[PDB]
Amino acid sequence: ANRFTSNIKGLTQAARNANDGISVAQTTEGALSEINNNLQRIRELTVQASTGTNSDSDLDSIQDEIKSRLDEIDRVSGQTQFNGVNVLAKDGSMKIQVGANDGQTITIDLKKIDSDTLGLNGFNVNGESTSDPLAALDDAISQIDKFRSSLGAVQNRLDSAVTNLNNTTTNL
Amino acid sequence: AQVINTNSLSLITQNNINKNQSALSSSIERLSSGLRINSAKDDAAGQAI
Amino acid sequence: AQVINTNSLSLITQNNINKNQSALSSSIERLSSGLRINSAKDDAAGQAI
Amino acid sequence: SEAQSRIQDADYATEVSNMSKAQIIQQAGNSVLAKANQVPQQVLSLLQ
Amino acid sequence: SEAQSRIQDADYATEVSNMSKAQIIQQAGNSVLAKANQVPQQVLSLLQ
Amino acid sequence: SEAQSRIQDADYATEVSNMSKAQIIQQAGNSVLAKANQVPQQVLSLLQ
């Protein structure tokens, strides 16, 4: 009976840790979605900028707005944090302890995401300009899309772990 | 009666309610906004597409 | 039930309503005037042109 | 745009029904949890 | 906000059952305490 | 005018939820206060 009670308490603590992780993942996912919106906004107006009808003076304003968006992306990347921990500051790993026994943890992976990491870091449209702005931006967006896919997968895994732990604790 | 220290039946009922909780929350959250994906707890490939 | 202090579900509902209201205000102000650009926080280059 | 419409759309017809089912389940669960809590008072009656 | 809700929340679903169970055990304990105070009365018959 | 409105805006959506939560907490507190007053009653039966 004492062993069973200890097991139940450990499983409850593991469920609480799983809740901590399930919140961390959704916060980071929302941050990256808000970042991706900026990439899309960059996409449409760099598409219009590539057209030769717009004069030289136009490209300066376009590049100014582009630089504003890039700086906003870098700022949102640096700022976002959870409980004194900067999620996007450095590429790293966080392990959520979801097992009462020692060593049973589920890994959460985070990769550093700044303006340089996604690519360009030197994006100019008024000249020399980037050799291929458009596919480079598409490649950048695909990376955040895969990142959201991974966070959704780990989100589902933590949800399943929580429900499994609840059933196990009730049976015990 | 047989169990006086522990209400295991209450635990079963609470588990059923908790199981319904996620469905209710997801349903109302998806109802509030137009998007079905809604910050994809749902299928990731569809969200990427 | 578990939601007691922070009605998180209705809270995300209210969050969605604000994102709706932003687009509603933009649409109504663009419809009221004949100018789509409307003091270009949207398309600065097009407005200069 | 028509292609995008299929992938993400609320489809309120299913959502309202699902919300109704979930509400009924939650209310029923709370109601039966009430009777579950009311069950164990026969212990006190047995004593006296 | 929804994150701190997990750390800080009353969760009446588990609390009301704990309250009811504690009350039942309390009344049972007081009843058995009265029946226990009834116990030492048999000495009087022995004395007389 | 919009500047003034931003500083002082009602935005009924949040306050209606807050007030509803307020009467929910109030009524729950009164309900539990009833049982709180009920708690010391059994001492009378403990007496005899």
Side-chain angles (χ1 to χ4, degrees):
Chain A
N2 190 359
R3 291 199 279 254
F4 283 163
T5 63
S6 302
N7 178 11
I8 286 147
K9 296 205 183 162
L11 298 166
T12 313
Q13 213 268 339
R16 288 314 280 261
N17 274 106
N19 284 307
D20 190 0
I22 193 66
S23 302
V24 167
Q26 65 183 357
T27 61
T28 304
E29 166 198 358
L32 277 296
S33 175
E34 293 178 353
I35 297 169
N36 168 39
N37 302 359
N38 290 318
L39 277 296
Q40 288 275 33
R41 189 34 160 269
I42 297 169
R43 173 91 201 251
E44 65 183 1
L45 56 89
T46 186
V47 162
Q48 66 86 29
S50 66
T51 286
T53 75
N54 296 0
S55 179
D56 186 74
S57 177
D58 291 331
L59 323 178
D60 267 349
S61 71
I62 301 163
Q63 170 68 338
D64 291 331
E65 191 277 332
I66 280 288
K67 175 53 52 63
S68 293
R69 286 297 198 167
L70 261 63
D71 292 331
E72 182 65 26
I73 298 175
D74 196 349
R75 183 191 76 73
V76 62
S77 68
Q79 183 283 310
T80 182
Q81 72 92 5
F82 187 85
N83 189 359
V85 165
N86 290 316
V87 287
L88 310 192
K90 184 62 51 63
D91 182 313
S93 179
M94 168 161 192
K95 296 183 290 294
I96 300 301
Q97 187 269 332
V98 307
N101 61 16
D102 293 28
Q104 189 148 17
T105 63
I106 172 172
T107 301
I108 297 172
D109 189 358
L110 277 298
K111 54 192 301 303
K112 194 202 141 193
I113 301 299
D114 65 23
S115 296
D116 181 74
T117 300
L118 321 173
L120 294 174
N121 194 7
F123 182 76
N124 176 302
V125 308
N126 50 40
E128 184 79 329
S129 82
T130 301
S131 71
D132 174 79
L134 191 162
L137 294 174
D138 199 337
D139 291 331
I141 304 187
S142 68
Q143 187 174 182
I144 297 89
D145 295 348
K146 296 183 290 294
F147 182 76
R148 269 87 62 71
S149 292
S150 176
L151 277 296
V154 300
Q155 218 182 19
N156 271 7
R157 304 184 44 171
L158 277 296
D159 189 358
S160 296
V162 176
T163 186
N164 189 359
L165 282 185
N166 294 359
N167 190 350
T168 290
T169 61
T170 61
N171 300 310
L172 290 173
Chain B
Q2 296 293 320
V3 298
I4 303 163
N5 173 82
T6 300
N7 208 317
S8 71
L9 195 150
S10 80
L11 294 172
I12 297 169
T13 310
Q14 293 149 37
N15 261 18
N16 305 123
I17 307 167
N18 292 5
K19 214 182 301 213
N20 180 30
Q21 293 179 356
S22 178
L24 179 63
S25 82
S26 174
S27 64
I28 297 173
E29 190 277 331
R30 213 180 310 151
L31 188 58
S32 68
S33 51
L35 281 72
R36 185 165 64 82
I37 300 298
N38 283 139
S39 161
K41 194 52 141 163
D42 295 330
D43 281 5
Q47 161 67 97
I49 293 182
Chain C
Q2 72 277 31
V3 60
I4 293 167
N5 284 18
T6 61
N7 189 359
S8 180
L9 182 61
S10 75
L11 183 151
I12 320 175
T13 311
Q14 303 144 220
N15 192 332
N16 290 318
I17 306 158
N18 296 115
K19 294 202 301 273
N20 186 6
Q21 282 215 21
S22 178
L24 183 63
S25 63
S26 162
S27 69
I28 190 167
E29 66 183 1
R30 207 178 261 119
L31 183 63
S32 75
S33 53
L35 183 63
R36 45 161 281 211
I37 312 302
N38 263 357
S39 82
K41 61 185 269 194
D42 307 337
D43 290 9
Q47 201 268 299
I49 301 299
Chain D
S1 66
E2 171 46 0
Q4 212 154 350
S5 64
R6 331 185 195 279
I7 303 187
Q8 83 274 20
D9 173 316
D11 196 316
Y12 302 112
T14 56
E15 274 313 325
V16 298
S17 44
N18 296 6
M19 180 271 289
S20 170
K21 310 169 194 252
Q23 282 187 338
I24 304 314
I25 299 313
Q26 202 169 42
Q27 298 188 38
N30 295 339
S31 313
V32 300
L33 179 61
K35 294 181 176 67
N37 306 139
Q38 307 282 9
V39 161
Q41 287 71 241
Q42 290 76 241
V43 186
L44 296 177
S45 77
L46 294 174
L47 294 174
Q48 59 87 30
Chain E
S1 170
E2 73 163 331
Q4 65 182 357
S5 66
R6 315 203 208 277
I7 286 186
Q8 73 154 100
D9 186 307
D11 189 358
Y12 293 103
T14 61
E15 291 325 330
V16 64
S17 65
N18 275 115
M19 181 205 98
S20 166
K21 275 282 201 153
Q23 293 204 254
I24 301 301
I25 297 169
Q26 196 191 68
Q27 289 97 48
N30 285 356
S31 297
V32 65
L33 183 63
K35 278 196 265 283
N37 292 118
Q38 295 325 313
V39 176
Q41 299 273 0
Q42 285 72 242
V43 191
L44 316 188
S45 284
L46 311 173
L47 301 173
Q48 60 86 29
Chain F
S1 66
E2 271 286 20
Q4 179 177 358
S5 179
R6 296 198 206 277
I7 297 294
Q8 70 203 39
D9 63 358
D11 201 316
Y12 281 43
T14 176
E15 293 83 3
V16 62
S17 60
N18 285 36
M19 71 75 78
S20 178
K21 157 181 174 170
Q23 306 90 6
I24 301 299
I25 296 170
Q26 179 182 2
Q27 184 192 331
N30 296 20
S31 297
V32 298
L33 174 48
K35 283 173 267 274
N37 280 357
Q38 202 35 52
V39 176
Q41 183 94 330
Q42 203 264 320
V43 166
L44 283 71
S45 66
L46 183 147
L47 271 183
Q48 63 84 30

